Amino acid sequence: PPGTVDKKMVEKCWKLMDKVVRLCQNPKLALKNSPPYILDLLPDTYQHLRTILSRYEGKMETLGENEYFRVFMENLMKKTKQTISLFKEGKERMYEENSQPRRNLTKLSLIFSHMLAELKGIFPSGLFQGDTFRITKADAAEFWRKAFGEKTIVPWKSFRQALHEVHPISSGLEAMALKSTIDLTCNDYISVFEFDIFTRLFQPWSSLLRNWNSLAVTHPGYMAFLTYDEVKARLQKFIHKPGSYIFRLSCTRLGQWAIGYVTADGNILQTIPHNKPLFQALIDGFREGFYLFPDGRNQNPDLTGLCDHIKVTQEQYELYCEMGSTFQLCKICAENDKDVKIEPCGHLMCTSCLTSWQESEGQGCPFCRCEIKGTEPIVVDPFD
Ligand SMILES: [Ca+2]
Ligand SMILES: [Zn+2]
Ligand SMILES: [Zn+2]
């Protein structure tokens, strides 16, 4: 658990948000207007923090002791610094839109968008309501209830253990890919907010991990977080091949899928499935003749059977973890660059995370838990 929140610390936390706004306002960045838009998100977050701070005028002591708020204010500060220090490494590079520095900045923009949607849904109108927060899914709610009570936020370790007992997680690699999908704010905790979003995306709860594995980890269709212009641009490659479709998440509508697709007229359209789980929109859109070729590919998965339990290669996980971010980054901390390789499993990571896993009596390789017989140094930005 992080320490307490005295106002001295919310103040620094605002001086930082201001530094990132300045850095990101630079005309050279020519940051795309399109969401997630960090130049809106930070002001907005600042403004809700004030809203919160006003509703706790007398009660400023019981606010400081709120676990969720302590974790959130510490993540906000860490992420705000990671952004600042990003600009400080990247320098001149920040100014070309396809840089790895600029890629990282776009991953962070998303995280800010997730932290605000969490803050607004846990402190609606400025008042803590996390202990009452309703998990949209009966079975999922039961799970959180039975395992966690009215806790708003739980550490990943605890969450992983808990979930494992009902939907078994067979390998550190699967676990790492799971954590990659649920842990939206990237702080090593799961909130009842994130838990609700996930369980909605990958319902029905009865076959949860089996749904995520088939829709997210090994589906060519899955695009994770895309803008709509980004969807159109990826389908344009297939504008002459009716039935081509991809599906994506939307930072402005957490918890819902959006399917893009190519029609026989040479048009890209888009629909939000709302009624069923995604795998039933996809099964139906196939039967109907609309969703045929995921990402342009002729071999489209067979999802029936989601209603003989498809297994996943460790490689498929590894590649899936690499999916969200630049390759340069350690997918343990999501903060530093990779700089070491682990024999004989082959996994990459930053030296800091590795010696940390060891110092904490971790079992072998932080990813797969297999035994290291050796390690070796790698450089991720060779020409700099
Ligand atoms: Ca989190
Ligand atoms: Zn790391
Ligand atoms: Zn490994």
- The string of DSSP letters for 39-52 reads HHHHHHHHHHHHHH
Give the resolution value in Å.
2.7
- Judge contact between 333 and 342, C-beta under 8 A: no
What tokens were used for 323? 């999916």
Residue type (1 letter), 164: H
Residue type (1 letter), 139: D
Method by which the model was determined: X-ray
Cβ neighbors of 216 (< 8 A, separation 6 or more) are 181, 202, 222, 320
- Judge contact between 248 and 257, C-beta under 8 A: yes
> Final residue of a domain: which of 129, 154, 172?
129
**b or e along 350-381 (b: 16 or more beta carbons within 10 Å of the residue's beta carbon)?**
beebbeebeeeeeebbbbbebeeeeeeeeebe
Q: What is the dihedral of CA 113, 191, 183, 1, to 10 degrees?
A: 110
CA 345 to CA 373: how far, in whole Å?
9
CA 318 to CA 10: how far, in whole Å?
38
Radius of gyration in angstroms for the set of CA atoms belonging to the chain, rounded to a whole number? 21
| Alpha helices for 91-127 (secondary structure H) | 100-122
The angle formed by the CA atoms of residues 48, 51 and 55, to the nearest 5 degrees, is: 145
> Final residue of a domain: which of 190, 218, 246?
218
> How many separate domains does the chain show?
4
Q: Could you tell me if 297 and 251 lie in one domain?
A: yes
Task: Report phi then psi at 277, rounded to 5.
Answer: -65, 160
Q: Which residues pair with 349 in a beta bridge?
A: 340
Task: Report phi then psi at 45, rounded to 5.
Answer: -70, -35
CATH number at residue 154: 1.10.238.10
Tokens 């990237």 belong to residue: 186
Q: Could you tell me if 98 and 153 lie in one domain?
A: no
Please tell me the number of the ligand nearest to residue 330's CA: 2
Q: Could you tell me if 6 and 125 lie in one domain?
A: yes
Q: How far is the CA of 2 from the centre of ligand 1 (A)?
A: 14
Q: Could you tell me if 49 and 91 lie in one domain?
A: yes
CATH number at residue 371: 3.30.40.10
Residues making up the chain, counted from first to last: 384
What tokens were used for 240? 């002459």
Give the closest residue to 156 by CA, choosing from 123, 195, 103: 195
Task: Report phi then psi at 220, rounded to 5.
Answer: -65, -25
Q: Could you tell me if 211 and 148 lie in one domain?
A: yes
What tokens were used for 355? 């010696």
Q: Could you tell me if 329 and 381 lie in one domain?
A: yes
Q: How far is the CA of 345 from the centre of ligand 2 (A)?
A: 17
* Helix/strand/coil for 133: coil
> Final residue of a domain: which of 250, 280, 304?
304
CA 320 to CA 217: how far, in whole Å?
6
Q: Could you tell me if 1 and 115 lie in one domain?
A: yes
CA 371 to CA 374: how far, in whole Å?
9
Please tell me the number of the ligand nearest to residue 370's CA: 3
The angle formed by the CA atoms of residues 143, 2 and 85, to the nearest 5 degrees, is: 110
Cβ neighbors of 227 (< 8 A, separation 6 or more) are 34, 35
Q: Could you tell me if 2 and 114 lie in one domain?
A: yes
- Crossing angle of helices 38-55 and 7-25, rounded to 10°: 160
- Judge contact between 254 and 313, C-beta under 8 A: no
- Judge contact between 283 and 304, C-beta under 8 A: yes
Q: Could you tell me if 318 and 384 lie in one domain?
A: yes
- Judge contact between 157 and 214, C-beta under 8 A: no
CA 132 to CA 254: how far, in whole Å?
20
CATH number at residue 46: 1.20.930.20
Q: Which secondary-structure segment (H or E) carries 309?
A: none
Q: How far is the CA of 350 from the centre of ligand 3 (A)?
A: 13
Residue type (1 letter), 315: E
| Three-state SS annotation for 235-292 | HHCCCCCCCEEEEEECCCCCCCCEEEEECCCCCEEEECCCCCCHHHHHHHHHHHCCCC
Give the closest residue to 26 by CA, choosing from 92, 82, 98, 114: 92
Q: Could you tell me if 16 and 125 lie in one domain?
A: yes
Task: Report phi then psi at 292, rounded to 5.
Answer: -105, -45
Q: Could you tell me if 193 and 285 lie in one domain?
A: no
C-alpha separations of 282 from 74, 157, 288, 311 in Å: 40, 33, 10, 20
Q: How far is the CA of 172 from the centre of ligand 3 (A)?
A: 9
Kindly give the pairing relationship between strand 348-349 and strand 340-343.
Answer: antiparallel
Which parts are annotated binding residues for Ca(2+)? Answer: 183, 185, 187, 189, 194
Q: Identify the domain containing residue 207 by its residue range.
A: 130-218
Q: Could you tell me if 10 and 125 lie in one domain?
A: yes
Task: Report phi then psi at 335, rounded to 5.
Answer: -115, -60
- Judge contact between 24 and 32, C-beta under 8 A: no
- Judge contact between 90 and 101, C-beta under 8 A: yes
Q: How far is the CA of 161 from the centre of ligand 3 (A)?
A: 20
Burial class (CB in 10 A: 0-12, 13-18, 19+), 302: exposed
